[PDB]
């Protein structure tokens, strides 16, 4: 009949804080011993973290787990709306599974989009993705961030295997943990960019890193399903999908292309398109948040 007063969806697709450290070129195999790069203070006063002179390569390591159980809310007010909402996620996953979304998530893991202000001048980034089955590697992967684009949808068999792995995760049929290590040649003594605190850089125990939701916004760049005349590219998924740096705010509630009007048109009265905006609303439910009154 109507919408519940509260409706929260928890965080599936959980990233960690990517630990960054120094390293040398063409030594990509035995990665266990390199010192983590911390943050120093210079001159009102600024905190600056720089690579050493004999360290031309930056390593970033992050372990993405995926939870699964996509359209399962945690806090509601009525069982009728919950039953219809589970019916909508059911007819999604039976109409078409986690096939188009997971290829985009595996693409954003494949290209080093999570290296935010280092990929803009990165001469060579390689990524190794290890699927952790029991305590060690089950299946390994090997990509280069340059050969994979950042705006067009490529195709590979190994990337189809990684998409099938993440899809077997998000559908609820396994425990999925992916250790991603990215080696990036930057050269001697440039400026790496760990995240900034409330100018103070972020470090956990004398070791700088990138925040968790920074990397979590790196892979949420799967929204191409919006009615603009092109020129931006793939944007991140939010209700009234918007970019804070540009100041532009698409999907505005005058034009029915947002999350909420699409929700009460599809869940209550069954109006939603085939693929595109359905992929947007399921990607927002996978991201999670609080909806309702």
């Amino acid at each position: 009949l109507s919408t519940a007063s509260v409706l929260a969806f928890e965080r599936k697709l959980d990233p960690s804080d990517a630990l960054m450290s120094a390293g040398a070129w063409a030594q990509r195999d035995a990665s266990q011993e390199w010192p983590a790069v911390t943050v120093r203070e210079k001159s009102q006063t600024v905190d600056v973290a720089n690579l050493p002179s004999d360290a031309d390569t930056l390593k970033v390591r992050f372990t993405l787990r995926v939870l699964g159980g996509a359209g399962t809310p945690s806090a509601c007010n009525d069982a009728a709306y919950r039953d219809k909402l589970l019916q909508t996620v059911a007819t999604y996953v039976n109409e078409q599974g986690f096939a188009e979304l997971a290829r985009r998530y595996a693409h954003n893991l494949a290209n080093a989009r999570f290296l935010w202000r280092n990929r803009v001048g990165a001469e060579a980034v390689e990524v190794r993705i290890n699927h952790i089955r029991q305590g060690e590697v089950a299946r390994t992967w090997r990509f280069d961030a340059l050969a994979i684009g950042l705006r067009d949808f490529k195709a590979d068999a190994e990337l189809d295997a990684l998409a099938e792995l993440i899809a077997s995760g998000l559908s609820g049929s396994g425990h999925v943990l992916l250790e991603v290590v990215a080696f990036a040649r930057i050269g001697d003594g440039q400026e790496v960019f760990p995240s900034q605190e409330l100018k103070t850089l972020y470090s956990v125990r004398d070791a700088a890193a990138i925040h968790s939701q920074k990397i979590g916004n790196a892979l949420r760049t799967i929204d191409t399903w919006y009615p603009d005349e092109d020129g931006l590219g793939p944007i991140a998924v939010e209700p009234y999908g918007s970019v804070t740096s540009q100041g532009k705010a698409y999907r505005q509630p005058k034009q029915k292309l947002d999350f909420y009007t699409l929700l009460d048109n599809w869940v209550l009265r069954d109006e939603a398109p085939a693929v595109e905006q359905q992929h947007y609303v399921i990607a927002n439910l996978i991201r999670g948040g609080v909806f309702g009154e």
Partner: peptide, 8 residues
């Protein structure tokens, strides 16, 4: 320069 959300 092509517009992006990637680097303003």
């Amino acid at each position: 320069l092509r517009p992006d959300p990637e680097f303003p």
